[PDB]
Amino acid sequence: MITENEKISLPKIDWALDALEPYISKEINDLHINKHHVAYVNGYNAAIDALEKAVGKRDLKSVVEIQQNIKFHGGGHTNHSLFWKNLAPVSKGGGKHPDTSSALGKQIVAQYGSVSNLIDITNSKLAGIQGSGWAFIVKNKQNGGALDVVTTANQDTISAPHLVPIIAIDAWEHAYYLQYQNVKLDYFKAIWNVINWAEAESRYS
């Protein structure tokens, strides 16, 4: 029994399916959003509906079973929503580095010395992921807004109340396979050319 202000939907994306070429093919973006993300949107909504029913009648065997789907689709929708938002065509700023005069920029130089180095780290983490997963540049609000590079598995997302996702990078094969196939190393590097750091600076404050 999912209600109006409970259900989610696919977000409006601020760029064209081909606006990220030649770094990300429109064939991927098409399938990824409209195919993969749509599946998560449907999954979360159906999972919530299934809960009001199972919970509504004290069936914990089902309640516990449905939990997984909610973590998966709910985290999937969240991750991809973050993903599109920190992506932009080179035209609209994509690939433009954080300002040496911005809060986020100064923080990267203090902890990592340069945005360049932070990328080598994030890329190493991404290449490290075994199976499906994500990489994040997170801000920890409980230890003085310190930045860190964290890796989640599958659809898991930054859910800790004190953690705030700054940049999300998809490591699922579906994200890069049609264009890069096995060579995920090329995809990890290339994607920085379309990363919307303006959104990162926005999230940092």
Q: Which residues are annotated as a binding site?
A: 32, 80, 170, 174
Pairing mode, if any, of strands 133-140 and 163-170? antiparallel
Lookup result for tokens 């959003």: 33
Q: Which of 91, 97, 96, 80 is nearest to 19 (CA)?
A: 91
Pairing mode, if any, of strands 163-170 and 146-153? unpaired
Partner whose binding site includes residue 170, from a copy of itself, Mn ion, none (CB under 5 to 8 Å by kind): Mn ion
From candidates 138, 149, 170, 200, binder to Mn ion by CB under 5 A: 170
SS3 134: strand
The site that binds a copy of itself (CB under 8 A) totals a number of residues, namely: 61
Partner whose binding site includes residue 146, from Mn ion, a copy of itself, none (CB under 5 to 8 Å by kind): a copy of itself
Lookup result for tokens 């890329």: 123
> In whole angstroms, what is the distance from residue 75 CA to residue 154 CA?
9
Lookup result for tokens 């609209």: 92
Q: Does 172 bind Mn ion (CB under 5 A)?
A: yes
Contact flags string 116-155 toward a copy of itself, x per CB under 8 A = -----x--------xxxx------x-xxx-xxxx---xxx
Partner whose binding site includes residue 15, from a copy of itself, Mn ion, none (CB under 5 to 8 Å by kind): none
Partner whose binding site includes residue 148, from Mn ion, a copy of itself, none (CB under 5 to 8 Å by kind): a copy of itself
> In whole angstroms, what is the distance from residue 29 CA to residue 89 CA?
13
Q: Does 111 bind a copy of itself (CB under 8 A)?
A: yes
Q: Does 42 bind a copy of itself (CB under 8 A)?
A: no
> In whole angstroms, what is the distance from residue 87 CA to residue 192 CA?
9
Stretch that binds a copy of itself, among 10-18, 29-37, 97-105, 189-197 (CB under 8 A): 29-37
Residues 6+ apart with CB under 8 A from 130: none
SS3 136: strand
Which structure tokens are listed for 95?
């690939």
Q: Compare residues 5 and 91 and give the one whose CB is closer to a copy of itself.
A: 5
Q: Which residues bind a copy of itself (CB under 8 A)?
A: 3, 5-6, 8, 31, 35-36, 39, 44, 48, 51, 55-58, 60-65, 67-68, 70-72, 74-75, 77-78, 110-112, 121, 130-133, 140, 142-144, 146-149, 153-155, 157-161, 172-174, 177-178, 181-182
